[PDB]
Amino acid sequence: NTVSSFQVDCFLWHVRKRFADQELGDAPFLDRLRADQASLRGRGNTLGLDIETATRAGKQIVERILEEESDKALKMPASRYLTDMTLEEMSRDWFMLMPKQKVAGSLCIKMDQAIMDKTIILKANFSVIFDRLETLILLRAFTEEGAIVGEISPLPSLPGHTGEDVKNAIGVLIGGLEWNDNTVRVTETIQRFAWR
Amino acid sequence: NTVSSFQVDCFLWHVRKRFADQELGDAPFLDRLRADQASLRGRGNTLGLDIETATRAGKQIVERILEEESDKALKMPASRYLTDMTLEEMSRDWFMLMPKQKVAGSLCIKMDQAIMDKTIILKANFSVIFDRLETLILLRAFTEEGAIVGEISPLPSLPGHTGEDVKNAIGVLIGGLEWNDNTVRVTETIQRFAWR
């Protein structure tokens, strides 16, 4: 019922205690240890379970969380994060006068149809595995005048996208922008790890 | 400085999160997880360290606490706890009219010199290893009338006592009580695992 967590808390307290027992602790850490020691005393007396017994049970529970595969996440060959945009560029507000958008590939593609005869460069932040795109964080279209006129973003509620879905989204965005006689290019990052 | 603990907290949060992720959690556990998730977000932004990076560093720190000998406490062959007294008997108030006491063997020996011509039984709670006494919790002398007239207790500030120190303390207590024509015996627990 409630003993599973109590036991986990008692073991994790022990672990934090051992951390303190080996120095390096800041004052708020020791303060939390004191508050938790008092709270665990209370919870123990209410439950009737000795702190060391609970600690050992917690140890076995924590091991159970960490048993079997544990955290041996050796199936993600060090993805490298590549960026063309700063956090401000990704979070910057923008608007479309004649908005146009669609969903495909678990990606949302947006572009302003009011943009005409402009020169546009695409910038993106994304993860790369084996010299190819693996996850898209964000792509935005900027005019030479600095306006944001299009965007490709992942949809968090759908099964994740692939590199080919992003390549298709980029091609679709470029096509739609080119319709209005815009000149569209991509950064070297996109040109090297993705495709126009 | 303060990153060592923060990192430990982030990993331990992850562990508690995985516990939640595998059910069995009570409402206060999840509530603490929410408060801690918000607090860790704050602490992260203040420190500038990503929660996953801190989590991995915390994992390595926790492993460091648990590395080498870890908790392989295989040098304490299952001590068995034997009791003659309830918690109330050990915590019961008592007094000596003519107090007498000494320190020896990292034990405090007390007896009331005013007790005469009584029949006394000694009761004790202690740990046993290999069919012999290893740690004394408490020993008290009771008259047949129920009065507490003597006590042998460990002193927490001194190097721990041995079984032979307790045997000597019991012999000394019995001797002092016998001086005043008291008849003193011990429980079967003491007679089997210690000596008069």
Side-chain angles (χ1 to χ4, degrees), chain A residues 1-22 24-55 57-58 61-64 66-74 76-194, chain B residues 1-22 24-55 57-58 61-64 66-74 76-194:
Chain A
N1 205 34
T2 307
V3 174
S4 324
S5 324
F6 176 76
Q7 291 173 340
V8 172
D9 285 343
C10 291
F11 180 71
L12 297 176
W13 184 90
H14 186 81
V15 171
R16 287 185 290 156
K17 177 62 163 54
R18 294 294 182 187
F19 176 81
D21 265 335
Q22 328 190 344
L24 308 118
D26 61 355
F29 185 81
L30 296 175
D31 288 339
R32 287 193 295 278
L33 284 172
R34 285 181 55 87
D36 290 346
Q37 186 171 8
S39 295
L40 289 174
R41 178 182 174 189
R43 289 166 68 198
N45 192 31
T46 300
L47 294 174
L49 174 61
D50 182 85
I51 296 298
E52 180 63 17
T53 297
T55 297
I61 292 168
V62 171
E63 293 176 350
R64 289 173 180 175
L66 299 175
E67 272 289 351
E68 292 177 350
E69 289 176 3
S70 187
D71 289 345
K72 293 179 179 179
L74 297 191
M76 318 295 169
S79 64
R80 180 165 64 97
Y81 184 45
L82 284 70
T83 61
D84 293 322
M85 293 182 282
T86 57
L87 293 175
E88 188 273 333
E89 284 169 285
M90 291 194 293
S91 63
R92 190 181 301 161
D93 287 352
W94 65 294
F95 63 93
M96 297 180 272
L97 184 65
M98 295 173 176
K100 177 172 174 173
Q101 66 185 269
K102 67 175 292 187
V103 175
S106 301
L107 302 169
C108 177
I109 301 173
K110 297 179 184 178
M111 62 172 274
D112 191 351
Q113 296 182 80
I115 303 299
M116 300 177 185
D117 298 307
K118 302 294 181 276
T119 301
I120 298 173
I121 183 167
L122 306 185
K123 300 188 182 185
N125 294 10
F126 55 88
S127 294
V128 172
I129 298 178
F130 304 138
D131 291 308
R132 66 174 178 85
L133 172 65
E134 162 266 291
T135 302
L136 180 67
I137 281 68
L138 190 67
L139 179 152
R140 288 184 161 185
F142 294 83
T143 66
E144 289 294 352
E145 294 78 47
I148 299 168
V149 297
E151 179 178 73
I152 300 171
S153 63
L155 297 173
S157 66
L158 299 178
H161 62 275
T162 64
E164 297 300 306
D165 289 315
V166 174
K167 289 177 181 172
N168 291 337
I170 293 169
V172 171
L173 177 59
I174 291 169
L177 291 169
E178 287 179 342
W179 188 267
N180 284 322
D181 299 307
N182 295 306
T183 298
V184 183
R185 68 184 187 278
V186 302
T187 60
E188 188 70 20
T189 305
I190 292 170
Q191 191 68 50
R192 184 175 179 195
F193 298 94
Chain B
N1 205 34
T2 307
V3 174
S4 324
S5 324
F6 176 76
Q7 291 173 340
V8 172
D9 285 343
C10 291
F11 180 71
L12 297 176
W13 184 90
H14 186 81
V15 171
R16 287 185 290 156
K17 177 62 163 54
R18 294 294 182 187
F19 176 81
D21 265 335
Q22 327 190 344
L24 308 118
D26 61 355
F29 185 81
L30 296 175
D31 288 339
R32 287 193 295 278
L33 284 172
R34 285 181 55 87
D36 290 346
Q37 186 171 8
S39 295
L40 289 174
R41 178 182 174 189
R43 289 166 68 198
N45 192 31
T46 300
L47 294 174
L49 174 61
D50 182 85
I51 296 298
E52 180 63 17
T53 297
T55 297
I61 292 168
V62 171
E63 293 176 350
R64 289 173 180 175
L66 299 175
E67 272 289 351
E68 292 177 350
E69 289 176 3
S70 187
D71 289 345
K72 293 179 179 179
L74 297 191
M76 318 295 169
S79 64
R80 180 165 64 97
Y81 184 45
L82 284 70
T83 61
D84 293 322
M85 293 182 282
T86 57
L87 293 175
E88 188 273 333
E89 284 169 285
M90 291 194 293
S91 63
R92 190 181 301 161
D93 287 352
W94 65 294
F95 63 93
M96 297 180 272
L97 184 65
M98 295 173 176
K100 177 172 174 173
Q101 66 185 269
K102 67 175 292 187
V103 175
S106 301
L107 302 169
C108 177
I109 301 173
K110 297 179 184 178
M111 62 172 274
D112 191 351
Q113 296 182 80
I115 303 299
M116 300 177 185
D117 298 307
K118 302 294 181 276
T119 301
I120 298 173
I121 183 167
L122 306 185
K123 300 188 182 185
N125 294 10
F126 55 88
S127 294
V128 172
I129 298 178
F130 304 138
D131 291 308
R132 66 174 178 85
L133 172 65
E134 162 266 291
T135 302
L136 180 67
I137 281 68
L138 190 67
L139 179 152
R140 288 184 161 185
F142 294 83
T143 66
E144 289 294 352
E145 294 78 47
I148 299 168
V149 297
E151 179 178 73
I152 300 171
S153 63
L155 297 173
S157 66
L158 299 178
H161 62 275
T162 64
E164 297 300 306
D165 289 315
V166 174
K167 289 177 181 172
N168 291 337
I170 293 169
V172 171
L173 177 59
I174 291 169
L177 291 169
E178 287 179 342
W179 188 267
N180 284 322
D181 299 307
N182 295 306
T183 298
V184 183
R185 68 184 187 278
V186 302
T187 60
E188 188 70 20
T189 305
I190 292 170
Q191 191 68 50
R192 184 175 179 195
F193 298 94

